[PDB]
Amino acid sequence: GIVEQCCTSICSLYQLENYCG
Amino acid sequence: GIVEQCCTSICSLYQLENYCG
Amino acid sequence: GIVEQCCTSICSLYQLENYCG
Amino acid sequence: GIVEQCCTSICSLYQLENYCG
Amino acid sequence: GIVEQCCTSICSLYQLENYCG
Amino acid sequence: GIVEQCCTSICSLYQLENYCG
Amino acid sequence: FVNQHLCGSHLVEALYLVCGERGFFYTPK
Amino acid sequence: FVNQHLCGSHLVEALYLVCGERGFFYTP
Amino acid sequence: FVNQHLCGSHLVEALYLVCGERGFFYTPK
Amino acid sequence: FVNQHLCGSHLVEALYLVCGERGFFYTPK
Amino acid sequence: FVNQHLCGSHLVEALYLVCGERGFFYT
Amino acid sequence: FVNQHLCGSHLVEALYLVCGERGFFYTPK
Ligand SMILES: [Ca+2]
Ligand SMILES: [Ca+2]
Ligand SMILES: [Ca+2]
Ligand SMILES: [Cl-]
Ligand SMILES: [Cl-]
Ligand SMILES: [Zn+2]
Ligand SMILES: [Zn+2]
């Protein structure tokens, strides 16, 4: 999940766009 | 859509819960 | 206070409503 | 009323301070 | 300024990147 | 800098004002 | 489109808060 | 009015910073 | 410290939505 | 769960800004 | 007036995410 | 560290509120 990946380590914006619909 | 319903008039917490998963 | 009760453990929306005026 | 005074015009810090405890 | 450019019309992510250090 | 000073101990508004332009 | 963008930013925060664990899906027009 | 509702949301955030430990009572 | 200062910022925002017309009073004490 | 909740609030804002008109799925657990 | 001030608050938040390590200017 | 990242997000909000029209130049440094 996004919480597991991005709440202990910083996620870049291009990493976050992978979760877009 | 949620935009057309809650961005011209105030929606309560109960109206917004209809868009839950 | 609300900090010692909701920042050490998660508070629900019902528990937050206790502090409404 | 803080909404009527500060949502029709910009309120500075001193005007905002008057609503503290 | 950025306010006159991006608060009268929506600016894209690339347009915001113009103001980065 | 700002992060190393105001993210390990809280900073007042007067301390933050010194970082204004 | 400025107002709708500002409203949408507050809607997603409210959806995150009021919905908690069920999750939500947000989409514009 | 949503714009007034959104302005109130930012007002309490500003009240939180300025007031600090004295606190505040958002009446509206 | 910093952790609870950040938590309180989200707390008052949550109280603003939940309480609504009734309002609320915040005290870190 | 305090840190997870605070982290999730910013991720939702970040997803809203990045995805834009595409939208995004959110599911805590 | 008020609307510009509210929009500016979201601008800096957007600048913080986009710019990252580079930082940003707000004038 | 995510907590440092989240803390900086609140710093720019406070800087915007305090500096106002004078502006500011944020740097993580
Ligand atoms: Ca917020
Ligand atoms: Ca905020
Ligand atoms: Ca925000
Ligand atoms: Cl807004
Ligand atoms: Cl936070
Ligand atoms: Zn806003
Ligand atoms: Zn936060």
Nearest-angstrom CA–CA distance, D18 and C6: 27
Resolution (A): 2.4
Nearest-angstrom CA–CA distance, F12 and K10: 22
Q: Which domain holds residue H17?
A: 1-28
Ligand 4 centroid, distance to A12 Cα (angstroms) = 25
Ligand lying nearest the CA atom of residue G13: 1
Q: Which residues contact B4 (CB under 8 A, 6 or more apart)?
A: G29
Q: Which residues contact C5 (CB under 8 A, 6 or more apart)?
A: C11, C15
Q: Per the CB < 8 Å rule, is A12 touching K20? A: yes
Place of tokens 């406070």: L14
Nearest-angstrom CA–CA distance, E16 and F3: 22
Nearest-angstrom CA–CA distance, E17 and F20: 21
- Confirm if L13 and I6 have CB atoms less than 8 A apart: no
The sign one gets for the Cα dihedral H8, H12, K17, C12 is negative
Q: Give me the number of domains chain K comprises.
A: 1
Nearest-angstrom CA–CA distance, F14 and J24: 39
CA distance H6 to chain G (A): 8
Strands (E), chain A: none
Burial class (CB in 10 A: 0-12, 13-18, 19+), G25: middle
CA distance C7 to chain J (A): 6
> Angle at the Cα of L15 (from L10 to L21), degrees rounded to 5?
145
Q: Per the CB < 8 Å rule, is H27 touching D17? A: no
Give E-chain residues touching L25 at CB under 8 angstroms.
21
What are K19's two structure tokens? Answer: 């710019």
CA Rg value for chain F: 8
CA distance K10 to chain H (A): 10
Q: Which of F4, F10, H20 lies closest to I2 in space, CA to CA?
A: F10
Chains A and J touch (3+ CB pairs under 8 A): yes
Give J-chain residues touching G26 at CB under 8 angstroms.
16, 23-24, 26
Phi, psi of H4 (to 5 degrees): -65, -40
Q: Per the CB < 8 Å rule, is L8 touching K25? A: no
Q: Per the CB < 8 Å rule, is C9 touching J5? A: no
Ligand 3 centroid, distance to I29 Cα (angstroms) = 25
The residues whose Cβ lies within 5 A of ligand 7, an ion, are: I 6; L 6
Determined by which method? X-ray
Q: Which of C13, K4, L27, E9 lies closest to H10 in space, CA to CA?
A: K4
Mutate which of H7, H11, H12, H13 to test chain K, going by most K C-beta atoms within 10 A? H7
CA distance L13 to chain F (A): 11
Exposure letters L1-29 (e unless 16+ CB within 10 A, then b): ebbebbbbbbbbbbbbbbbeeeebebbbe
Q: Which of K14, B10, C20, C10 lies closest to H1 in space, CA to CA?
A: B10
